[PDB]
Scaffold this active site. Structure first.
Site, PDB file in Angstrom:
ATOM      1  N   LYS A 108      13.433  -4.296   1.605  1.00 38.96           N
ATOM      2  CA  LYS A 108      14.013  -3.615   0.467  1.00 38.96           C
ATOM      3  C   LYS A 108      14.434  -2.249   0.936  1.00 38.96           C
ATOM      4  CE  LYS A 108       9.252  -3.094  -0.930  1.00 38.96           C
ATOM      5  NZ  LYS A 108       8.315  -3.450  -2.021  1.00 38.96           N
ATOM      6  N   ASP A 139       7.449  -1.923   8.297  1.00 35.74           N
ATOM      7  CA  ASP A 139       6.564  -2.882   7.661  1.00 35.74           C
ATOM      8  C   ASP A 139       6.820  -4.356   7.857  1.00 35.74           C
ATOM      9  OD1 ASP A 139       4.783  -1.012   6.646  1.00 35.74           O
ATOM     10  OD2 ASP A 139       5.969  -0.697   4.835  1.00 35.74           O
ATOM     11  N   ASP A 171       9.534  -8.897   3.023  1.00 35.30           N
ATOM     12  CA  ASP A 171       9.591  -8.039   1.847  1.00 35.30           C
ATOM     13  C   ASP A 171      10.547  -6.877   2.064  1.00 35.30           C
ATOM     14  OD1 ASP A 171       8.876  -7.135  -0.800  1.00 35.30           O
ATOM     15  OD2 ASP A 171       7.483  -5.692   0.086  1.00 35.30           O
ATOM     16  N   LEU A 184      10.054   8.923   9.613  1.00 37.25           N
ATOM     17  CA  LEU A 184      11.491   9.169   9.456  1.00 37.25           C
ATOM     18  C   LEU A 184      11.590   9.910   8.129  1.00 37.25           C
ATOM     19  CD1 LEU A 184      11.563   6.465  11.350  1.00 37.25           C
ATOM     20  CD2 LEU A 184      13.986   6.593  10.845  1.00 37.25           C
ATOM     21  N   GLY A 202       0.773  -1.223   0.000  1.00 34.89           N
ATOM     22  CA  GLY A 202       0.000   0.000   0.000  1.00 34.89           C
ATOM     23  C   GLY A 202       0.806   1.274   0.000  1.00 34.89           C
ATOM     24  N   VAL A 203       0.123   2.354  -0.352  1.00 30.21           N
ATOM     25  CA  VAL A 203       0.733   3.668  -0.419  1.00 30.21           C
ATOM     26  C   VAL A 203       1.028   4.215   0.974  1.00 30.21           C
ATOM     27  CG1 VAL A 203      -1.566   4.653  -0.501  1.00 30.21           C
ATOM     28  CG2 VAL A 203       0.401   6.047  -1.152  1.00 30.21           C
TER      29      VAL A 203
HETATM   30  N1  LIG Z   1      10.762   9.410   4.643  1.00 33.25           N
HETATM   31  C1  LIG Z   1      10.102   8.387   4.306  1.00 33.25           C
HETATM   32  N2  LIG Z   1      10.046   8.095   2.995  1.00 33.25           N
HETATM   33  C2  LIG Z   1       9.329   6.990   2.702  1.00 33.25           C
HETATM   34  N3  LIG Z   1       9.262   6.700   1.431  1.00 33.25           N
HETATM   35  C3  LIG Z   1       8.740   5.643   0.878  1.00 33.25           C
HETATM   36  C4  LIG Z   1       7.458   5.122   1.261  1.00 33.25           C
HETATM   37  C5  LIG Z   1       6.929   3.970   0.615  1.00 33.25           C
HETATM   38  C6  LIG Z   1       7.668   3.334  -0.416  1.00 33.25           C
HETATM   39  C7  LIG Z   1       8.935   3.847  -0.802  1.00 33.25           C
HETATM   40  C8  LIG Z   1       9.467   4.994  -0.157  1.00 33.25           C
HETATM   41  N4  LIG Z   1       8.697   6.200   3.614  1.00 33.25           N
HETATM   42  C9  LIG Z   1       8.830   6.604   4.903  1.00 33.25           C
HETATM   43  C10 LIG Z   1       8.227   5.837   5.885  1.00 33.25           C
HETATM   44  C11 LIG Z   1       7.570   4.615   5.527  1.00 33.25           C
HETATM   45  C12 LIG Z   1       6.958   3.805   6.519  1.00 33.25           C
HETATM   46 CL1  LIG Z   1       6.176   2.342   6.067  1.00 33.25          CL
HETATM   47  C13 LIG Z   1       6.989   4.193   7.883  1.00 33.25           C
HETATM   48  C14 LIG Z   1       7.634   5.401   8.265  1.00 33.25           C
HETATM   49  C15 LIG Z   1       8.254   6.228   7.283  1.00 33.25           C
HETATM   50  O1  LIG Z   1       8.867   7.376   7.681  1.00 33.25           O
HETATM   51  N5  LIG Z   1       9.526   7.693   5.300  1.00 33.25           N
END
Ligand SMILES: Nc1nc(Nc2ccccc2)nc(-c2cc(Cl)ccc2O)n1
EC number: 2.7.11.22
Length: 294
Positions: A125, A141, A123, A79, A16-17
């Site tokens: 990455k 995740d 998963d 983050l 998910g997004v």
């Molecule tokens: N700074 C920042 N970028 C991104 N990009 C990103 C999101 C989804 C796919 C690829 C890149 N995801 C996060 C983030 C994601 C999750 Cl799960 C939990 C806390 C988080 O701070 N944070």
């Protein structure tokens, strides 16, 4: 949701997004992930909810699990940058070894923690790894694949990343073990070092063959039971293992040694996160400050 005066969509994960949002009320900035239909499984909500109890410096905190309008939202501490973005931004100079080492050590601590709590990511990455200005790196995740089950093609149709998938998964093993995460981390470690994905497969068979071309086609010697794997085909080409110093130059023997243990074909021989933490490679680990441009 109205509780958030949303900041923006920041990426698309396998499940998910993810959105950056501000909790109007508290003014808290968090990462909101909308899980992708039937109406949201019950066993999943319970299992994911349990992840809210996960507390570790190298695990992105799951703040809330909200079920509403037949939609599941995971609220995570936020983050500022994911490792994929950091690597792209550091592609010209590379991430200094001390930082790569620090990140790997912390990532292994996070995995050691989750694995000891019977929680697998499945998963992993670069985009799942988040960093902050103070040198910390966290895995986000976990437990989603085990709670929802691996998809195949996102609702918006987005190229699923196969690059970090362990060979046992590629060979159709129905049962996963903590080893799949070590493999993914090994691939990420190699990538931070070389500044290029280790096994950038275009398809599932290309992914598998890229692995085979580098590590050699597995056989019953190196991986007992491999020829009986669900998707194993005796027709697989037989590639000899490549000299490993060719895989992650210019990484030193400690790093190459650790990496080779993280990339063992047999999930059973593959090094554990706990064991990896004791590898000589980390004898001089420190916690450098990354140059982060937010
Ligand atoms: N700074 C920042 N970028 C991104 N990009 C990103 C999101 C989804 C796919 C690829 C890149 N995801 C996060 C983030 C994601 C999750 Cl799960 C939990 C806390 C988080 O701070 N944070």
């Amino acid at each position: 949701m109205e509780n958030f005066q949303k900041v923006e969509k920041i990426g698309e994960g396998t499940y998910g997004v993810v959105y950056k949002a501000r909790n109007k009320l508290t003014g808290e900035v968090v990462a909101l992930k909308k899980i992708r239909t039937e109406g949201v499984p019950s066993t999943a909500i319970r299992e994911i909810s349990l992840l809210k109890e996960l507390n570790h410096p190298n695990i992105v905190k799951l703040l809330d699990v909200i079920h509403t309008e037949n939609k599941l939202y995971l609220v995570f501490e936020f983050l500022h940058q994911d490792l994929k973005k950091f690597m792209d931004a550091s592609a010209l100079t590379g991430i200094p070894l001390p930082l790569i080492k620090s990140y790997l050590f912390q990532l292994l601590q996070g995995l050691a923690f989750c694995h000891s709590h019977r929680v697998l990511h499945r998963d992993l990455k670069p985009q799942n790894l988040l960093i902050n200005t103070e040198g910390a790196i966290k895995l986000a995740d976990f437990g989603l694949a085990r709670a929802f089950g691996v998809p195949v093609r996102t609702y918006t149709h987005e190229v699923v990343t196969l690059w970090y998938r362990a060979p046992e998964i590629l060979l159709g093993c129905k049962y996963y073990s903590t080893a799949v995460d070590i493999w993914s981390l090994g691939c990420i470690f190699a990538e931070m070092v070389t500044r290029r994905a280790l096994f950038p497969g275009d398809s599932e068979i290309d992914q598998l063959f890229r692995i085979f071309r580098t590590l050699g086609t597995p056989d019953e010697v190196v991986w007992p039971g491999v020829t009986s794997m669900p998707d194993y085909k005796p027709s697989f080409p037989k590639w000899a293992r490549q000299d490993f110093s060719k895989v992650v130059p210019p990484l030193d023997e400690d790093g190459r040694s650790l990496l080779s243990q993280m990339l063992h074909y047999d999930p059973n021989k593959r090094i554990s996160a706990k064991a990896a933490l004791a590898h000589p490679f980390f004898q001089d680990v420190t916690k450098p400050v990354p140059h982060l441009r937010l």
